[PDB]
Amino acid sequence: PFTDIISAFKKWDSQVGCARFREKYRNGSLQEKCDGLKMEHVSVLVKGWTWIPDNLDNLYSCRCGLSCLWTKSSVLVDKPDALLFETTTPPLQRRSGDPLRVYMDLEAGRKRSGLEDMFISYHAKDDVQSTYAGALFHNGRNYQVSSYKNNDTLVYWSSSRCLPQRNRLAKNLLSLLPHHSFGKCLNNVGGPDMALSLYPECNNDASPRWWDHLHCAMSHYKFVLAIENTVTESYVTEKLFYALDSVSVPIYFGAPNVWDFVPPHSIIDGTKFKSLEALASYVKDLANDPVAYAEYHAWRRCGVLGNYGKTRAVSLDTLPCRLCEAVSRRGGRNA
Amino acid sequence: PDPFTDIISAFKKWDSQVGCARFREKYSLQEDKCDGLKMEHVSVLVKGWTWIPDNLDNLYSCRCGLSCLWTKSSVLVDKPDALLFETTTPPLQRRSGDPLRVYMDLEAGRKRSGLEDMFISYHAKDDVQSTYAGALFHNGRNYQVSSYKNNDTLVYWSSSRCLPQRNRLAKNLLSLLPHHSFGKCLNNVGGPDMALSLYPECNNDVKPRWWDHLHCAMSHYKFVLAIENTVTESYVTEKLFYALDSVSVPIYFGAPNVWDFVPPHSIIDGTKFKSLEALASYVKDLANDPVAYAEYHAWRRCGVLGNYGKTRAVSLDTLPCRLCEAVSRRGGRNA
Numbered sequence: 001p002f003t004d005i006i007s008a009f010k011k012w013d014s015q016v017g018c019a020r021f022r023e024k025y026r027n028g029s030l031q032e033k034c035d036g037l038k039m040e041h042v043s044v045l046v047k048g049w050t051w052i053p054d055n056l057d058n059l060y061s062c063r064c065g066l067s068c069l070w071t072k073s074s075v076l077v078d079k080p081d082a083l084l085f086e087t088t089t090p091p092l093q094r095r096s097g098d099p100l101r102v103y104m105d106l107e108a109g110r111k112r113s114g115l116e117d118m119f120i121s122y123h124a125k126d127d128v129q130s131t132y133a134g135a136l137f138h139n140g141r142n143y144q145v146s147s148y149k150n151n152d153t154l155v156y157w158s159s160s161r162c163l164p165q166r167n168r169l170a171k172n173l174l175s176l177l178p179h180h181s182f183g184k185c186l187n188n189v190g191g192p193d194m195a196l197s198l199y200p201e202c203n204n205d206a207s208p209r210w211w212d213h214l215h216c217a218m219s220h221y222k223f224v225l226a227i228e229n230t231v232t233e234s235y236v237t238e239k240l241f242y243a244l245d246s247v248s249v250p251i252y253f254g255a256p257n258v259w260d261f262v263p264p265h266s267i268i269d270g271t272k273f274k275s276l277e278a279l280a281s282y283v284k285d286l287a288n289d290p291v292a293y294a295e296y297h298a299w300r301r302c303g304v305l306g307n308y309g310k311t312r313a314v315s316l317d318t319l320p321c322r323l324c325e326a327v328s329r330r331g332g333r334n335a
Numbered sequence: 336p337d338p339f340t341d342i343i344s345a346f347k348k349w350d351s352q353v354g355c356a357r358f359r360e361k362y363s364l365q366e367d368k369c370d371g372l373k374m375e376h377v378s379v380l381v382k383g384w385t386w387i388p389d390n391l392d393n394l395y396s397c398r399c400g401l402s403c404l405w406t407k408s409s410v411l412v413d414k415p416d417a418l419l420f421e422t423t424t425p426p427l428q429r430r431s432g433d434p435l436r437v438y439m440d441l442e443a444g445r446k447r448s449g450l451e452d453m454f455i456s457y458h459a460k461d462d463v464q465s466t467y468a469g470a471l472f473h474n475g476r477n478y479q480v481s482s483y484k485n486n487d488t489l490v491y492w493s494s495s496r497c498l499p500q501r502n503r504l505a506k507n508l509l510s511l512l513p514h515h516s517f518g519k520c521l522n523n524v525g526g527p528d529m530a531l532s533l534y535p536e537c538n539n540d541v542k543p544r545w546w547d548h549l550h551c552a553m554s555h556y557k558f559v560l561a562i563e564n565t566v567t568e569s570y571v572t573e574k575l576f577y578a579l580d581s582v583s584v585p586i587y588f589g590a591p592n593v594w595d596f597v598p599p600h601s602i603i604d605g606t607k608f609k610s611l612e613a614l615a616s617y618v619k620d621l622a623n624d625p626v627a628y629a630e631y632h633a634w635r636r637c638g639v640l641g642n643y644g645k646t647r648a649v650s651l652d653t654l655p656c657r658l659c660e661a662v663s664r665r666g667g668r669n670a
């Protein structure tokens with residue numbers, strides 16, 4: 001029933017070793033030359049948004065000598081090459097010589113507005129993909145990662161939009177695993193903001209906010225329960241990725257193609273078990289096996305990312321440049 | 336002779352009278368082959384620092400299929416390939432199999448510790464360059480850019496570490512130009528914290544920090560005075576770049592090779608005038624000529640960055656990837 005994560009890493013190094021890991025894991029769902037770029041500089045004005053962060057605003061330097069000015073200020077860009085509308089209605093029509101219309105929605109469904117020339121979603125088969133494996137949204141958080149895992153409680157969970165089926169699965173699974181549930185749904189920790197009470201070191205000096213201490217709180221738990229609000233192709237949100245960011249193993253119920261997005265041996269796919277009891281038994285055995293637990297961090301410690309590298313390459317953090325690149329290939333205002 | 340205040344009107348007048356085509360007709364940094372990469376994944380642990388921000392921490396996806404895990408947490412990286420020390424003393428010795436020792440200092444002088452295997456500075460001839468033209472350092476700021484320039488007051492300046500030569504230059508120049516001086520040195524606004532008194536819209540809605548409103552305040556002024564604390568080769572700091580970020584023309588006293596870093600016709604180099612009175616006369620004449628003033632923004636509006644693109648390409652924002660690539664070419668721990 002270990003609590004020292006670094007000791008577990010060392011024991012795994014002694015018994016298994018990264019060389020064995022690399023051989024055992026030496027054996028499409030993501031968007032992957034400087035010949036089509038018609039514009040050496042592209043400007044993007046974020047005209048409408050609901051959540052798009054200010055911390056995306058920048059004059060980025062992209063590949064192929066492309067410059068990309070992304071801003072919400074019409075003074076910085078008064079004649080943009082493209083307008084981005086995130087969950088906002090684009091113009092009804094586009095005449096040639098008007099800026100390109102870009103619509104963006106990362107919620108499940110790939111709901112195009114029908115008034116865009118380009119669509120941004122989480123899916124690779126749309127115009128520009130933006131995955132959730134990024135650091136720019138919710139930037140300015142607490143970055144502490146605990147060196148001690150909880151001895152009794154193994155599972156973290158937080159949900160505040162209590163959906164019937166998700167809550168049903170959560171109740172059934174959490175009845176078999178000692179857990180802390182900090183959200184409004186199925187709370188077993190008491191009040192509404194107990195995460196900062198148990199772990200005062202996770203407080204953000206700048207703030208509060210629900211996300212400023214999420215990673216730090218998760219880092220204390222060996223497992224994080226991650227259940228998406230919608231089961232559909234390529235819809236993998238921060239519920240998984242933040243756990244990977246916080247040295248915690250996610251127990252995942254979500255997109256069927258999740259293994260195209262995550263590193264090898266990094267998550268516990270709940271859909272791959274015959275029963276919830278078998279899942280809980282596996283989790284309880286992992287909580288008492290430091291070597292087998294550290295196998296789930298060997299992807300990070302040994303640098304075997306598998307498909308995770310490609311996933312983070314097309315996240316929100318790189319969205320401006322790639323969007324600018326596409327705008328450059330289309331001629332911008334001359335499309 | 337128009338003492339203009341509408342910056343966009345000046346932009347449109349310049350567009351009609353001058354145009355981007357005529358502008359394009361009229362007109363050291365580290366640049367970069369994917370085979371020397373001996374490591375497909377590199378980890379960097381920031382072991383010592385004084386100012387390096389937490390929000391640089393991320394698992395970056397870089398060029399040539401390289402992954403780069405940059406963090407301050409020994410839990411995220413317990414066996415780093417490289418240790419970074421920013422203005423802190425590295426280990427006295429390095430044995431093979433130890434992480435590479437990286438020392439970093441962006442202050443003028445390129446002063447090393449003598450105990451590093453890699454040196455990061457602002458200069459291109461050191462191991463890895465990090466210019467000041469980045470957006471990540473003070474990410475949490477106000478992004479409003481004023482559409483109105485001041486009619487009477489033409490120059491913004493702020494300095495609070497009063498250096499003799501800089502203060503003499505500032506006193507002589509600012510006696511000839513209507514100006515607002517907000518720092519402790521040569522204050523003419525009535526005391527400290529006066530910027531938020533004049534421009535309440537520049538408030539950052541997070542705890543109030545000193546840097547939250549510099550760009551927004553500068554956007555109200557046609558010109559920003561930027562005098563470096565040291566005149567030396569390639570030492571161009573944010574005193575210039577923030578003015579470029581807030582649509583204000585900087586009057587620059589600094590590095591002799593500054594024109595290798597900035598866009599064409601983007602700054603006023605004060606050393607290129609016979610006297611400070613001639614400089615003040617040129618600035619006063621420019622403040623009443625909206626077309627000639629907007630020529631100084633044509634670099635941004637027409638997407639002609641010149642050398643500015645490369646400068647931003649090697650700023651702090653891209654430092655993790657570039658450092659990781661350099662470590663990968665050297666073999667990391669096996670050097």
Ligand SMILES: *[C@@H]1O[C@H](CO)[C@@H](O)[C@H](O)[C@H]1NC(C)=O
Nearest residue numbers: 337338339340485486487488
């Ligand atoms: C301010 O602008 C007004 C209107 O253009 C003008 O009459 C006045 O002379 C200006 N004052 C200064 C100090 O520039």
